[PDB]
Amino acid sequence: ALDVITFGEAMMLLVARPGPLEHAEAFHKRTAGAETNVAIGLARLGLKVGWASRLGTDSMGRYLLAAMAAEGIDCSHVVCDATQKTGFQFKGKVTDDPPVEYHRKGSAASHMGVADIDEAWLLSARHLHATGVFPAISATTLPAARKTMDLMRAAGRSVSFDPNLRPTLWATPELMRDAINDLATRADWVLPGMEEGRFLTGETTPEGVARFYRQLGAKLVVVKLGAEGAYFDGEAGSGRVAGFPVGAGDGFAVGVISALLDGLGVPEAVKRGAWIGARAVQGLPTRAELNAAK
Amino acid sequence: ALDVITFGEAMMLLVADRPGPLEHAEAFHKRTAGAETNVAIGLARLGLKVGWASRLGTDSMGRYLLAAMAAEGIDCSHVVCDATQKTGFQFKGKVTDGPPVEYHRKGSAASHMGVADIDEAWLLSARHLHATGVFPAISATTLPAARKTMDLMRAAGRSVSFDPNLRPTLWATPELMRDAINDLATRADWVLPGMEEGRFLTGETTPEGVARFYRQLGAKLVVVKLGAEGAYFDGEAGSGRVAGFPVGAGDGFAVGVISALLDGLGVPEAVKRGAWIGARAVQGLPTRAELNAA
Numbered sequence: 001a002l003d004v005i006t007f008g009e010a011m012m013l014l015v016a017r018p019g020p021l022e023h024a025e026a027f028h029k030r031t032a033g034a035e036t037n038v039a040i041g042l043a044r045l046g047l048k049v050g051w052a053s054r055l056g057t058d059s060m061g062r063y064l065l066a067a068m069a070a071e072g073i074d075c076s077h078v079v080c081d082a083t084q085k086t087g088f089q090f091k092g093k094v095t096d097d098p099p100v101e102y103h104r105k106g107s108a109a110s111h112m113g114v115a116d117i118d119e120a121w122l123l124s125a126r127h128l129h130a131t132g133v134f135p136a137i138s139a140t141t142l143p144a145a146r147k148t149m150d151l152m153r154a155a156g157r158s159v160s161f162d163p164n165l166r167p168t169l170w171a172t173p174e175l176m177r178d179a180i181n182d183l184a185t186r187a188d189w190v191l192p193g194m195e196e197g198r199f200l201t202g203e204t205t206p207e208g209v210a211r212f213y214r215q216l217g218a219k220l221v222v223v224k225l226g227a228e229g230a231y232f233d234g235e236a237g238s239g240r241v242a243g244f245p246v247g248a249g250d251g252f253a254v255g256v257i258s259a260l261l262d263g264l265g266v267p268e269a270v271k272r273g274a275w276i277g278a279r280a281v282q283g284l285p286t287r288a289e290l291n292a293a294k
Numbered sequence: 295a296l297d298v299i300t301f302g303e304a305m306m307l308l309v310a311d312r313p314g315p316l317e318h319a320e321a322f323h324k325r326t327a328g329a330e331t332n333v334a335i336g337l338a339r340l341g342l343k344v345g346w347a348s349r350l351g352t353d354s355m356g357r358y359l360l361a362a363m364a365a366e367g368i369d370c371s372h373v374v375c376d377a378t379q380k381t382g383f384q385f386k387g388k389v390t391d392g393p394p395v396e397y398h399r400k401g402s403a404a405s406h407m408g409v410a411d412i413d414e415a416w417l418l419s420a421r422h423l424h425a426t427g428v429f430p431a432i433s434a435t436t437l438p439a440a441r442k443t444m445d446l447m448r449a450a451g452r453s454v455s456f457d458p459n460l461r462p463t464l465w466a467t468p469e470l471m472r473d474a475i476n477d478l479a480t481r482a483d484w485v486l487p488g489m490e491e492g493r494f495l496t497g498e499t500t501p502e503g504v505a506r507f508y509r510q511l512g513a514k515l516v517v518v519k520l521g522a523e524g525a526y527f528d529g530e531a532g533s534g535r536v537a538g539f540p541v542g543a544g545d546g547f548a549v550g551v552i553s554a555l556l557d558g559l560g561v562p563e564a565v566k567r568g569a570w571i572g573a574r575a576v577q578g579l580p581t582r583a584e585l586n587a588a
């Protein structure tokens with residue numbers, strides 16, 4: 001019925017002329033949200049994607065739905081609730097990364113829990129993408145992310161996990177590490193950045209990060225090495241993939257998930273991610289631009 | 295030490311840059327909103343010593359509100375900027391002609407105010423308190439504080455102004471609205487109703503009636519606003535009508551009549567000031583200078 005499903009929060013991003021936020025007279029709308037950025041990537045590459053979440057019925061919320069719908073994303077499981085609020089966020093202009101101010105405590109998406117899961121619908125998908133953002137949002141969402149991956153594993157469906165770190169969202173670094181690595185226990189594909197891997201695992205090498213996720217029971221670990229590319233450790237074996245010259249994480253995740261699902265090999269999937277990773281840090285490609293690059 | 299104190303919530307006003315519905319906007323401009331504050335900005339531009347009391351977050355919107363209120367000359371020493379609480383905000387669309395506000399003010403820092411917030415010595419140090427129907431309508435903790443704010447200022451024989459604004463969305467039953475606004479009327483020297491509001495509040499259909507309703511509840515002055523028709527006034531020295539000029543306007547009106555009476559002008563010249571500023575606002579609250587032209 002559907003290639004990929006994600007659970008997460010989307011927010012309206014108001015982007016400021018530079019200086020401090022209080023001094024800006026004008027803002028432009030954009031869209032923000034970690035899982036939704038991967039959603040958009042996969043949709044633009046012609047995959048069938050559904051997004052689950054909550055939103056208020058307010059104008060911000062209405063804008064988010066439209067933006068998501070217009071990218072080609074099934075939003076049937078975005079409960080709109082007039083009793084709750086959408087989140088939003090401010091970013092200033094950078095001339096020299098602009099600091100982002102967030103307004104999302106108590107948002108509709110933070111109220112999600114296990115009761116928000118529609119099992120039959122989850123299962124109608126080939127693949128679940130999961131991130132360390134959604135589970136971090138609140139006390140209810142962490143269990144909801146657990147059940148989501150569990151449900152999907154037991155149905156013999158692909159589970160993808162990108163151990164994103166947002167220290168702002170978790171009580172203590174220790175708590176984040178325990179929650180992230182415990183969730184990695186429920187994934188088939190684990191996609192860690194090298195710096196997050198050092199942090200989560202204490203391993204100083206890509207091979208070390210990967211063995212760590214394999215030992216917690218994971219068929220595939222791809223470690224992102226930045227300029228030097230990526231390293232991968234799977235049931236077929238191991239190797240490195242060179243990457244590109246020169247945000248990059250999301251694009252890299254759009255890369256491997258989309259390739260592994262199109263039936264491509266693991267080195268070839270990693271190449272795609274390197275390509276979209278490099279490419280978007282400039283902007284998430286369509287199939288048109290994909291095919292054009294080789 | 296201060297001419298006038300008000301209590302109330304300011305919010306940040308985001309204005310759509312083009313006439314569409316809100317969700318289809320692409321840019322917004324920054325302004326201030328809030329009934330008590332608009333009155334405060336006008337009185338301050340007319341030269342009066344005005345102190346404002348409120349709560350705001352220490353988020354960027356809060357810091358904007360504090361700074362835009364202070365660049366007007368308003369005494370902000372009693373604005374608590376509480377880092378644990380959130381700043382209110384709103385959206386307005388542009389009207390090609392025909393606009394609707396979307397308010398985001400539930401559970402805001404200002405809604406948390408109560409009697410504990412009032413600094414008695416500080417209040418008493420101003421000649422006059424100006425009050426509205428909004429502040430008391432904000433949360434269950436603000437009504438007590440409006441009531442008490444007025445009580446205090448009267449017993450000390452200071453001057454109290456009341457503008458019976460109706461905001462139904464803010465009140466639980468319409469009837470409570472009527473009971474509360476009218477019970478507050480019990481605590482003002484000067485009551486500033488609009489005919490429409492007065493008809494709802496009092497049941498009367500002629501100004502002379504609306505006026506005698508609030509005289510009987512113990513007001514020294516009622517000035518009933520009539521639109522382009524001007525105003526009717528009913529006070530201890532006598533009654534009358536003022537023409538009113540030709541072509542937001544309530545707020546101008548009260549800035550006009552409050553500043554004149556505190557400036558030492560008689561009631562009838564005060565209502566015409568009120569009336570000039572009101573009509574100006576329909577077309578931007580005047581400097582003393584713009585005022586001295588006419």
Ligand SMILES: [Cl-]
Nearest residue numbers: 327328329428
């Ligand atoms: Cl208001």
